[PDB]
Amino acid sequence: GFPMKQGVLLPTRIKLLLTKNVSCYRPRRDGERKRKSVRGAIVGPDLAVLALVIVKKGEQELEGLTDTTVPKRLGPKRANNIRKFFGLSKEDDVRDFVIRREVTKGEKTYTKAPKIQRLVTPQRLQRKRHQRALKVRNAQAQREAAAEYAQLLAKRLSE
Amino acid sequence: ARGPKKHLKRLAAPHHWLLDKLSGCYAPRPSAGPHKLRESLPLIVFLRNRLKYALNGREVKAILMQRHVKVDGKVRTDTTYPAGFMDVITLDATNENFRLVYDVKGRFAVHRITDEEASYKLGKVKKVQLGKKGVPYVVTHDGRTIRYPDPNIKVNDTVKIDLASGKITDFIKFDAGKLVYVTGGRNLGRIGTIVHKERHDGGFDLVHIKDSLDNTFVTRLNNVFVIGEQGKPYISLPKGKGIKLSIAEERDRRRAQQGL
Amino acid sequence: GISRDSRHKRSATGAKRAQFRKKRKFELGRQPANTKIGAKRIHSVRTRGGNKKYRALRIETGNFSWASEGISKKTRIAGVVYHPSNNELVRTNTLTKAAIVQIDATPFRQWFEAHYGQTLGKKSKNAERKWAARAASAKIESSVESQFSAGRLYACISSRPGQSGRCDGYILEGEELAFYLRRLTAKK
Amino acid sequence: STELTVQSERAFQKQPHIFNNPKVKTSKRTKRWYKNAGLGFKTPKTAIEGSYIDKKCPFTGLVSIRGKILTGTVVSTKMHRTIVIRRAYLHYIPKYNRYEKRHKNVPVHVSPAFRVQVGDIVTVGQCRPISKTVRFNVVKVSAAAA
Amino acid sequence: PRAPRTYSKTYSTPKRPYESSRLDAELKLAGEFGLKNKKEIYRISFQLSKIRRAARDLLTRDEKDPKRLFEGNALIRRLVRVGVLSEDKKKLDYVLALKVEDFLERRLQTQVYKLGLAKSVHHARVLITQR
RNA sequence: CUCUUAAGGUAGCCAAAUGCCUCGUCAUCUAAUUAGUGACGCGCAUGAAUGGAUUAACGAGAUUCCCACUGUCCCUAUCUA
RNA sequence: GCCCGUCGCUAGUACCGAUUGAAUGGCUUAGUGAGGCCUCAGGAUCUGCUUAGAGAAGGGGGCAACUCCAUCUCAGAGCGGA
RNA sequence: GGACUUUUACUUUGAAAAAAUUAGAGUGUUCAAAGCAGGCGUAUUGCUCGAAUAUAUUAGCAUGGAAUAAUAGAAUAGGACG
RNA sequence: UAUCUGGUUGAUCCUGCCAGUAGUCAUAUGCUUGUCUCAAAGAUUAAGCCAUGCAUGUCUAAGUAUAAGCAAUUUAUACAGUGAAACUGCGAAUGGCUCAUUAAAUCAGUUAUCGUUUAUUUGAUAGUUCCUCUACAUGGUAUAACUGUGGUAAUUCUAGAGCUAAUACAUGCUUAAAAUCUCGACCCUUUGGAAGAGAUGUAUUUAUUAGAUAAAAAAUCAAUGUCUUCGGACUCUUUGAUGAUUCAUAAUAACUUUUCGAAUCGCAUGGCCUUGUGCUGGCGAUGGUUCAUUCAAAUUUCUGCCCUAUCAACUUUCGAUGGUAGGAUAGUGGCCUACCAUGGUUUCAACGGGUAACGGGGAAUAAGGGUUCGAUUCCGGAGAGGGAGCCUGAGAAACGGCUACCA
Ligand SMILES: [Mg+2]
Ligand SMILES: [Mg+2]
Ligand SMILES: [Mg+2]
Ligand SMILES: [Mg+2]
Ligand SMILES: [Mg+2]
Ligand SMILES: [Mg+2]
Ligand SMILES: [Mg+2]
Ligand SMILES: [Mg+2]
Ligand SMILES: [Mg+2]
Ligand SMILES: [Mg+2]
Ligand SMILES: [Mg+2]
Ligand SMILES: [Mg+2]
Ligand SMILES: [Mg+2]
Ligand SMILES: [Mg+2]
Ligand SMILES: [Mg+2]
Ligand SMILES: [Mg+2]
Ligand SMILES: [Mg+2]
Ligand SMILES: [Mg+2]
Ligand SMILES: [Mg+2]
Ligand SMILES: [Mg+2]
Ligand SMILES: [Mg+2]
Ligand SMILES: [Mg+2]
Ligand SMILES: [Mg+2]
Ligand SMILES: [Mg+2]
Ligand SMILES: [Mg+2]
Ligand SMILES: [Mg+2]
Ligand SMILES: [Mg+2]
Ligand SMILES: [Mg+2]
Ligand SMILES: [Mg+2]
Ligand SMILES: [Mg+2]
Ligand SMILES: [Mg+2]
Ligand SMILES: [Mg+2]
Ligand SMILES: [Mg+2]
Ligand SMILES: [Mg+2]
Ligand SMILES: [Mg+2]
Ligand SMILES: [Mg+2]
Ligand SMILES: [Mg+2]
Ligand SMILES: [Mg+2]
Ligand SMILES: [Mg+2]
Ligand SMILES: [Mg+2]
Ligand SMILES: [Mg+2]
Ligand SMILES: [Mg+2]
Ligand SMILES: [Mg+2]
Ligand SMILES: [Mg+2]
Ligand SMILES: [Mg+2]
Ligand SMILES: [Mg+2]
Ligand SMILES: [Mg+2]
Known about the structure:
This is part of a larger assembly, with chains A, B, C, D and E. Chain A is an alpha+beta fold. Chain A is built from 2 helices and 4 strands, in the order E-E-H-E-E-H. In chain A, the strands form 2 sheets. In chain A, strands 1-2 form a two-stranded antiparallel sheet. In chain A, strands 3-4 form a two-stranded antiparallel ribbon. By secondary structure, chain D is mainly beta. Chain D contains 1 helix and 5 strands; from the N terminus they run H-E-E-E-E-E. In chain D, a hairpin with a 2-residue loop joins strand 4 (121-131) and strand 5. The radius of gyration of chain D is 18 Å and the shape is elongated. Chains C and D meet through helix 6 of C and loops of D. Chain B: It is found in: Cytoplasm.
C-alpha cells in the first residue's frame, strides 16, 4: 500500500519524518510532523502498481486511452482568468462570456454560472473613493489641530 | 501557567460585585477593556444583578444583542465588558442615563443622571508624555489617550472630557483644597477635600483627606481622584455624598427612618 | 535545548539544588552565530512573540562610521585583526561586537578628497568656494592619515551581527586607536 | 583591593557614546559623564574627577537605584570591586516571647568612587541583578572608628 | 470546585458523663418541659454558654467602648424580643446570670401549654408536630 | 558418689596439614561440586613454650573462587629458521 | 519472712553473622550514544531575472525614413532563487 | 515654612491589603444548619432599607512618642561654631 | 467553655507512671436505621495498570460555493435563497484531574522592572511607496473540496492524472502646499549670486548631536546669521517627565536578502451637469503600522519553612565568588564562552541526611499561653507511565501535539 516518494533514490521502504506540503502526508494539525513510511523512487519488483504518464504517443491507438477524451469540469472564474481563456482585451467585459451549465430538475430546467471575482464593480470603485478621501480629510484635520495647538503653545509664553 | 486564564471561579471574583456563594462555579470574569478586571463591573452584573432587567445570562446577551445599551456613547455588545469609574451606560429605550460611581461601602452603585451629564465624564490623567513626531498625549484612567492637551495638565490632575468627540474641555489641577473621590482602599467610597499630599521619593505618596464632616483619613496618591472644588463636584453625587457613618450612627438612621 | 535558568547553578552557599521543574522555552538560549566573511547570507530566527532576530552567517560590506568627520560609509571588511574576548575569533576571522577589523578606505578616501580638495598624505568656483572654507579643519590625526596609504582602516564593531544581521562599526580614532594600536605591536 | 591603571584590560575602557573629537583641541583629555543617583545621594568628587570606568557604578555608569535601600556593616573587602555586607537583625519567636540574633550576608557592588574598608557601616541601594548574587550598590559610606 | 455550603453543630455534651446530680436535674427539665432527649437540653446548654461568653468578653472592655455598646445592646435587644431577658434586667450583668429554663420557657410547646390550648406539655407536643 | 593410675582436658580451637565412620550434618557458591568457604561438635585419636588461640606484613609453599586473558580445548589450519 | 545467680522447659522480640548476600530509588566515573534542533554540504524536482536571433502584433508620430510600454511561442549565452 | 532619629530596638496610630472560613450586626429559611435575602402598598403596570463591622500581632511602608536598652562624637585636638 | 477519678502500703503521705473521662471536616468497622433539610466521597496503600464510550471544536447581514445538494423562484445571463464538503480565520496554552517530585525551592505578605515579552479588549496613529513612455475601472500564477485511474489485511494512510476560488499564496499603482538641505550651469569681482538637479514617509542597524537650567559681566581663535541710519549693531529670543537615567521626543551622515502605509467584504442608491453607465457620497465590517490600555507572563527585593551533629566544615567535578569582553536571550544575570583574579557559605548550624513534605487561605482542640493537622471546594506551584527533545503559536518545553530512547 505504501507509495513511492519523489527522489529518495533507494528501492526499499524507509521511514521518514514528514512535514507539511510534502507527499504521502497530510498534517492533522498545524505543526504536526509524523514519522511515516515511504517507498523508494527506484522501480523494483515489489510494486503493486506503477503510475506512468504518456509523454509521446506511439503508432497505435490504445482503445480506452488515446481514443477517448474526457472533459475538464470547471471553467475560469476569476476576471482575467476568463480573459486569458478567451483571448480577450482588458476592455472586453467578462460576464457575457462565462461558462454556464444546465440544471435538469425533472420538469423545470435552469442554469448556473460562477461569480467572476476581482470583477471591477460600481461598488468597489466607491470604496477606493471613500478610503482616499478619508486619508486626505484626516490629514488636513490633523494639520489644523497641530497648528491650533502650536498656537496654544506660543500663548503659554507670550501672555 | 502556559498562557492567559479565561475563567473565574465564583468566589475569586470581586466582593463588591456582591454575587451569592451558591449559584454556579463561576463569575463572569471581565473581558479585556478600559478598566482593570478587579476595578470593573461587567454589563451582565449591571443588567441582571444591580438592575434586575435580566434574569438568565441568556437574557443579558439577548438584551445586548439588541444594541440596547451604550457605554460612553458607543453601543456595547460584549456580556463581560468591563465598565468602570465615571462610565456612563445609557439605556435608551427607557430614558435612563447612569454613571458608575462608588458607594460609601465600596460597591458600584446605581446612580442615575440627567440626559445631559451623560454627555461627559471626569477622567484622571495617568501619564502625560511626548509621543512620536513630537506630538504630546495624555492618558486618562479609562484607557483614553487624547493627543494635543493643555501643557498645564500634569499627572494626577483630572480632566473634563466631552464624550461624543473625545476632546478635553477644561480641567482641574491637583493641589490643596480640591474635592476628591476615593477610588479604592479601605476608604473606598469616601469623598472630601484634600489637606496635604505627603510626598515620598521612591514610593507611594500620602494624601490626607478631610470631608464635609471634618473626619480625617489618609490613602495613597494612586487612590485619589480629583472631582472638583470644595462643595462643588463636577459630577452629580450619589445619596449620602460619600460620607461614611459609624455603624452606631448607621444603626440609628435605619430604625428611626423606619416607622412612618 | 540550552537554558538560561539559574536553577542548574550551585547556590552561593555551595549547595547542590534538586531538580524543581522541567525546562521551559521561555528561558531558552540558542546556538551562537560565529559570523564569517563572505557572500551575504543571513538566516532569520523566529523569536518570542513574533519578532525576528537575524542570524548573519556570512558578511562582506558593513556600514561604518567616521565619527569626527560626521559621516558614515559602507566598506568591505577585510578581516578581523584583534578581539578582547578570545583570539580564536581572530584566527578564524569571526565577526562579533567589539571585534576590531580592517576595512576598505577607498570610500572614505573618496569622501575626504571631494569634501576637502586635498589628497591624503603623500576645478569650479563653487567647488573651490567651499574647499577654502572647509579648510583649516582638514588636518586629521597622523595615525589615521597614514592608514590610507594601505587602503585599509582599523575599525571596531559596535553592532551585534548574530542579532542585528548587520556588521556595522566605527573607524578607530583618538586614544582608542592608540590603545589597540599598542596591543597590535606586542603580538600581531 | 586595588584600583587599576584604567586601560588594564584587553578591551579598551570607556563610557559608551561619550565622544571627544580629536579634531578639536581641548583642556581635559577625556569627556566624563556622571549623574545624580537620586534620593539625596550626593555623587562624590571621586566619581567626577576620577579616571576609572566601572559600567556598574551608580554614578558614571549604566545602573539605576530603585527599591529597598539597606544599611549593613562591611564584613569582607576581598573581592575586586564588590564587597560583603553583614546585616544583623532580631527574629521574634512568639512562643518564648523573646528574640534571637539572626544575620544575613548581602553581596553588593562598590564603585571605585568609594575607598571602603572592613568595619565601615555602609548604605546600599537595590539595583537590578548585576551578577549572580549582587543586587545592591554602595551608595554612601559613613566613617570607620579611628 | 463549588462553594462550601457551610454548617455548624448546635450542641455539646457534658464533660463528666455520670453526675447523678446533673442527671437528676436534667430529667426534671425533661418532664417539666415535656422534652424528647438530652440533646434538647444540651442544645440550649450550649447556646447559653456562647451567650455568657460573648457577654463575659464585652464586660472586660471599657464601658462606652464602641464595640461593647453596639453588641452589648444588640445581645440584650435580641434576648428581650424573645422572652428570655426581662423588661428590666436589660443590662449585660443580668445576661450573665441568665439561667436555662429562661429559654426553655419560651418554647412553642411550653407556650401552647401556657395559654389553654393543651393542658399538658405532652399534649402540646403531639399537637404542634401535627399542624 | 565412685573406680583405675597421679590428675581427669580448664582458656581456647576443629571433620582443622590432627575425624575412623566420612563423600559427616546445616548454610553458602554451581545447571550439577568426593572440591572451597561459613557453621555445628560425646572431638576414632583437638588442646595450651611436647605451646594453645589470635594476627598486620611477607612467600618461585599447599588450596578455592572471581575479572582479565587467551589455540588448554571445540578443531584444527598456515608460515619462518 | 524476704531474696540473688548459674543451670533446666516453652514462646516472642531485636542483635551478631559466611553468603566478595539481595532488592528499589537518587547522584555519579569511564566508554558508547538515538532524536529533534542549529551549522558546513548535497540538489529528486521546480523556478524569478537578463540577453542575441525568428514568426504574429500595436503605434511613441512621418509623403518614403524614425520609435516606446504590455502579452504570448520554439535551438541558445549568461547569474540567480526555492 | 518644608525637610529633620549619629545609628537602632521598643511602643502608638494608620496605610496597601481576598474571598470562603472565624467573631459578629440586620433579616422570621414555618424552627434550625443555612441562605443573603428582603420589606411596604391602590398588589391595574408601583415604592423601598440592605448585602455592615471586627480579626491578622512576622516582615515591609507611613506616623505620634523617647521611658527603658543599645549606639556614635572633642584627649598628641587631625575638635566645634562663623 | 480555670473540676478530675481508679491502680504501689498493714496503714500514711509524696514521686510517678499506667488506666479512666471529653472532643475531633477523623478514617475504618460492628450492630441498628422511620421523616425533612444539607451533600462529602479511590487522597492515605499503587504519580500502579487500563477493555469500552464520551470529554474540543468553531459561521455573521458582512473572506472563498457552478455540490452533476436542496428549495426554487428571483426581474436575475456574472453572482444573489438555503447549504454538505473544502480552503481561509480563531480556538485547542482555558478548563478538569492529581500531589509525584520539591526544604531557601515552592509558597506567603512585601517590593522591583531606569531589566523584558505581551494574541486580545479599549483608546490613539499613515497625503510621502513610482520615476529621468509604468494596468489602479484592480497584476500573477497555484491548490483543496470535486471528477476520475489506483494501491493495502489494516488507521483520521494515501499515490499518480484532470478541474477551479480568496481577507489562502505571490505581486504592485497611488495624493495637496510649503519648508529645509546637499550638487551646482553660469556672472563678476564686490556687500559678492545664483538658475534647476537631487534628496527629505515609516520601520531596521551603527555613529554623532540636542534634550538647557543657581545667581553675573568681558576677551578671543574658528565658521557665518541677522539687520540698520553701510558705520558697525543684535533686544523682547527656544525646550517636557522622573527621587534618579545615555528618558520620552527631535536632529545629522549613512545602512537593509526593506517592516508597514487596504488590489478585502456587507448594507445602503442619495446628490451635482457638460448626461458619460461621468463625478461625487452615507452606516458598518474585516484588516493595518506605532504607541497607550487591558488580560497576562518572565525574572525580582526584604523577611519567613518540620526532624537531624550517630552530618562540622562546604563550594571551585567539568563555574564555585567576582572583574572585563563577547555570545546567547524577550530581556537582566557565570545563563554560556574567553581571559583574569581566589573568592563565596558556616556554631546566629553552613554542607549532608531524613520527611509515611506541594506552600498558603485554613482545620481540630475552647481560661489563657499552646498542642496537632492541612492529598482535598479558593489562591499559588507542579505533572500527565519515565526522561530528553521540538514543532505550531501571542502564549506550550503542551502530552485527550509530535520526535527519540526506557518501561
Ligand atoms: Mg473579491
Ligand atoms: Mg469573558
Ligand atoms: Mg517538577
Ligand atoms: Mg515584635
Ligand atoms: Mg591403686
Ligand atoms: Mg583443668
Ligand atoms: Mg583457667
Ligand atoms: Mg573435630
Ligand atoms: Mg582436610
Ligand atoms: Mg571447615
Ligand atoms: Mg572447581
Ligand atoms: Mg603446661
Ligand atoms: Mg611439655
Ligand atoms: Mg611471591
Ligand atoms: Mg596464539
Ligand atoms: Mg598448533
Ligand atoms: Mg509457633
Ligand atoms: Mg393604581
Ligand atoms: Mg518610629
Ligand atoms: Mg494492700
Ligand atoms: Mg489516657
Ligand atoms: Mg479527590
Ligand atoms: Mg492513588
Ligand atoms: Mg490549567
Ligand atoms: Mg496559476
Ligand atoms: Mg510560477
Ligand atoms: Mg506556483
Ligand atoms: Mg495535482
Ligand atoms: Mg528641560
Ligand atoms: Mg533613547
Ligand atoms: Mg518559608
Ligand atoms: Mg544512623
Ligand atoms: Mg542577558
Ligand atoms: Mg562576567
Ligand atoms: Mg580557591
Ligand atoms: Mg534522619
Ligand atoms: Mg511527597
Ligand atoms: Mg504540611
Ligand atoms: Mg493544601
Ligand atoms: Mg505544615
Ligand atoms: Mg500522598
Ligand atoms: Mg505542565
Ligand atoms: Mg497511570
Ligand atoms: Mg492556537
Ligand atoms: Mg511532554
Ligand atoms: Mg488522557
Ligand atoms: Mg491537556
